Amino acid sequence: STAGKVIKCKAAVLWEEKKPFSIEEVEVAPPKAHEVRIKMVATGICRSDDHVVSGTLVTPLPVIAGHEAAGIVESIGEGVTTVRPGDKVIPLWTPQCGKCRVCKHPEGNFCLKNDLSMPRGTMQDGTSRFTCRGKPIHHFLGTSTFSQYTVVDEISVAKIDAASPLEKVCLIGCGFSTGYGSAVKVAKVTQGSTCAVFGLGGVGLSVIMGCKAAGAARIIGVDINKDKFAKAKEVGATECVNPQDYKKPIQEVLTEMSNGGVDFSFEVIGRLDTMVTALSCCQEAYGVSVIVGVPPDSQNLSMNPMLLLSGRTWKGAIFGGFKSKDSVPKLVADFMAKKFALDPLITHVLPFEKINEGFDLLRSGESIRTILTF
Amino acid sequence: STAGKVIKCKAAVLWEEKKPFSIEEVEVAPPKAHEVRIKMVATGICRSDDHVVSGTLVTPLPVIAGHEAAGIVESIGEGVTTVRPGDKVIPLWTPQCGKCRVCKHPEGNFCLKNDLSMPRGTMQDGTSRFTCRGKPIHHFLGTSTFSQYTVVDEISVAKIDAASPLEKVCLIGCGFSTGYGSAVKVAKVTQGSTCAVFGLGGVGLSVIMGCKAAGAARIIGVDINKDKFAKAKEVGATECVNPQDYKKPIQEVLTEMSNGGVDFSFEVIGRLDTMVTALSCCQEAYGVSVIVGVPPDSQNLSMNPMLLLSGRTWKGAIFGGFKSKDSVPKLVADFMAKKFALDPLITHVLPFEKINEGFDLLRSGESIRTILTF
Numbered sequence A, B: 001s002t003a004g005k006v007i008k009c010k011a012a013v014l015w016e017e018k019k020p021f022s023i024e025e026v027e028v029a030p031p032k033a034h035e036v037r038i039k040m041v042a043t044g045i046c047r048s049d050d051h052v053v054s055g056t057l058v059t060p061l062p063v064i065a066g067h068e069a070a071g072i073v074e075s076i077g078e079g080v081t082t083v084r085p086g087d088k089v090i091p092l093w094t095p096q097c098g099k100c101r102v103c104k105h106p107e108g109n110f111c112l113k114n115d116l117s118m119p120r121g122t123m124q125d126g127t128s129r130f131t132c133r134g135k136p137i138h139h140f141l142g143t144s145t146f147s148q149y150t151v152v153d154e155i156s157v158a159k160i161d162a163a164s165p166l167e168k169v170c171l172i173g174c175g176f177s178t179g180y181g182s183a184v185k186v187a188k189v190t191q192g193s194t195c196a197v198f199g200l201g202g203v204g205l206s207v208i209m210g211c212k213a214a215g216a217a218r219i220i221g222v223d224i225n226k227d228k229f230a231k232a233k234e235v236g237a238t239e240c241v242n243p244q245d246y247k248k249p250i251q252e253v254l255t256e257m258s259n260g261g262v263d264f265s266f267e268v269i270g271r272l273d274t275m276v277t278a279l280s281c282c283q284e285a286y287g288v289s290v291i292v293g294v295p296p297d298s299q300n301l302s303m304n305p306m307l308l309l310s311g312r313t314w315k316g317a318i319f320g321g322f323k324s325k326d327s328v329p330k331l332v333a334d335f336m337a338k339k340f341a342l343d344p345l346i347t348h349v350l351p352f353e354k355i356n357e358g359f360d361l362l363r364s365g366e367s368i369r370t371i372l373t374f
């Protein structure tokens, strides 16, 4: 067997920003204590993976990216108790150590063991399990799912239902859970409310799904790409608007359409200007705006704090506010019981070897989620 | 009798920015339909009144300022049903019309009839009840309490307990209710939590009172004036820190003191820089920061939205989040029932004729609240 041995396999290595991935052989070390080595089955292309390529997100290079995925445990290191070889699993790019002050807090989920705030591109122990051309290669968010095999810390993996369709439930590893939780858990959308969702990609569609599940009466989708509107309406948008169609700024348009401002707004793009526009369009006394989009590295927004003094609430969240290891298995169980749908998010399927075509589809505006199969 | 007649009385007129009040005779018209004329008994000096003088707040001049006050109804216009001549009352600088979407919302209090967002300096009907030297004089926030008599709209006055000591409960008209509500209602401070309060004036002390009432374990007061610390500890601060004493930025100091960030922070000054510092010092995953201080007119702050993406909540509020006409009588009843103290806020009691000396005490750092007695 492969247990305890280096695995040679193919991965998509990013050597340089603004370049295609290189599909080539890597060496994947065996798992150390409290680590898990996973044979990947499916991985989604999230815009955050593209942010690594574009330098919107800064993480050390060279790197194996990928964070939205599902696979099967190949082997476990010493002392692992929560998964076994042959288990279906979803890697957790937001870990859940269960021990830090955030993991112990009833409403926190941004575990202090994350590799997001101050990215090292390593395992928890500060080292890498990947070699390529004899060179160490960085991890990404402790997951590195753009590889036939990855190694993750135990706090960065959840066991899921053995009957799970991995080519669908990989989306619970990022885009679905993030958008759905941003609506239902972070914003706490109320029955009969009016919501505005800026950005109608996979995450924004999942926000719409959550707003509809919460009983919103109106869900206004906002996108500069009108090709996104049909699917947004299919999953619950009641109106869609394209800011490019209007002479006035879209915050003014949305305030007029909502007879004085929306109850809940969501920024699901990653632009400083739309973060401020989304805040402005929620009602000034009781509105809530949630930032979901990832902003460009190290850039600050400018805003008038009178927008908050009148009573608005502004918040953001990682991974929909979900405590990742507790929540992922429950979300898979709910998917299996048909409590929500994932197919509306999946527009394209490709083999892993066609990863660059999958990124081209995202960048052209044509796809929502492309799922890559190993 | 005065009812139905013009009253000539003394008031403090502000003819231009950055000049002393002029204490002189004005004419006060009788109340029209749905208006109430009040003989003032006591009014507090709030920093927001000083903001009118300093140009921090823009409102039409000339003006009779004052918004934190209590008095006795002299007469009512046709159609008034909520107060009668002889009633003790507190003017409401945030009205409660009861009809607008904000008044009908369970968590809104910034009634759309307010004169804050787009100040007109008038009664609801767009006219003034004040003349001085033959010139019309603007109202301020529908209240204009720096006058022996004022006229307010019915939606801008609350009837209070007939046995109320007006030289104390005038503080329920602004500073106490604002700070206390910002803690208990807006932030929803939890038992055992750690709070940081930036600014230890009358409003910040009231925030501390609310944090202590909510059962906070630690309440860290922050002020550049160490003379403010003794009273802050008297009303519940467990520690006080002066940013000037430190080589590091105070957000770093407060993060260290709180072993990774506070649960709740409050900006109770009115500076863009301390609004961002207060947000930063709350724990990145689950912290809450409330803006209470009034920012300088038309100035934007700069901030990194990653502070929110990790999970922080940022909000602001007017008047502690309290629906004004519902809440003010209950707060007075609570004071009468010894549920909270007001004396710790009152450092000076002066005749109304010494209004300018009262403002000088505030500006010098020497007072918390001066109460002016008519």
Ligand SMILES: NC(=O)c1ccc[n+]([C@@H]2O[C@H](COP(=O)([O-])OP(=O)([O-])OC[C@H]3O[C@@H](n4cnc5c(N)[nH+]cnc54)[C@H](O)[C@@H]3O)[C@@H](O)[C@H]2O)c1
Pocket (backbone or CB within 6 Å): A046, A047, A048, A051, A174, A175, A178, A198, A199, A200, A201, A202, A203, A204, A222, A223, A224, A225, A228, A243, A268, A269, A270, A271, A274, A291, A292, A293, A294, A295, A317, A318, A319, A320, A365, A368, B309
């Ligand atoms: N907070 C989290 O945990 C988290 C998780 C997953 C994704 N993200 C971020 O969320 C964002 C969306 O991800 P995704 O859905 O995969 O991306 P996506 O598929 O690229 O969708 C973004 C959408 O925004 C639209 N858009 C671009 N500019 C504008 C504009 N000015 N106004 C309106 N619409 C515009 C665009 O046409 C597209 O449909 C990205 O920034 C991700 O990095 C955050």
Ligand SMILES: NC(=O)c1ccc[n+]([C@@H]2O[C@H](COP(=O)([O-])OP(=O)([O-])OC[C@H]3O[C@@H](n4cnc5c(N)[nH+]cnc54)[C@H](O)[C@@H]3O)[C@@H](O)[C@H]2O)c1
Pocket (backbone or CB within 6 Å): A309, B046, B047, B048, B051, B174, B175, B178, B198, B199, B200, B201, B202, B203, B204, B222, B223, B224, B225, B228, B243, B268, B269, B270, B271, B274, B291, B292, B293, B294, B295, B317, B318, B319, B320, B365, B368
């Ligand atoms: N949101 C509302 O409804 C509302 C109500 C009442 C007051 N306010 C505002 O709240 C603020 C405080 O009012 P107040 O308590 O009457 O004022 P105040 O009595 O002038 O108190 C302000 C305190 O801030 C301190 N301070 C000044 N600069 C700094 C600094 N850099 N760091 C730390 N401390 C500093 C100062 O020494 C003083 O003790 C003002 O901006 C008011 O306009 C808002």
Ligand SMILES: OCc1c(F)c(F)c(F)c(F)c1F
Pocket (backbone or CB within 6 Å): A046, A047, A048, A049, A057, A067, A093, A116, A141, A174, A294, A318, A319, B309
């Ligand atoms: O898509 C999820 C996602 C994020 F929300 C980030 F904030 C981030 F930095 C990142 F790398 C990521 F993958």
Ligand SMILES: OCc1c(F)c(F)c(F)c(F)c1F
Pocket (backbone or CB within 6 Å): A309, B046, B047, B048, B049, B057, B067, B093, B116, B141, B174, B294, B318, B319
């Ligand atoms: O002190 C209360 C108070 C405020 F909170 C304001 F925002 C404002 F503009 C104002 F005039 C005022 F008096």
Ligand SMILES: [Zn+2]
Pocket (backbone or CB within 6 Å): A046, A047, A048, A049, A067, A068, A174, A175
């Ligand atoms: Zn993602």
Ligand SMILES: [Zn+2]
Pocket (backbone or CB within 6 Å): A095, A096, A097, A098, A099, A100, A101, A102, A103, A111, A112, A113
């Ligand atoms: Zn943790």
Ligand SMILES: [Zn+2]
Pocket (backbone or CB within 6 Å): B095, B096, B097, B098, B099, B100, B101, B102, B103, B111, B112, B113
């Ligand atoms: Zn109203």
Ligand SMILES: [Zn+2]
Pocket (backbone or CB within 6 Å): B046, B047, B048, B049, B067, B068, B174, B175
């Ligand atoms: Zn005030």
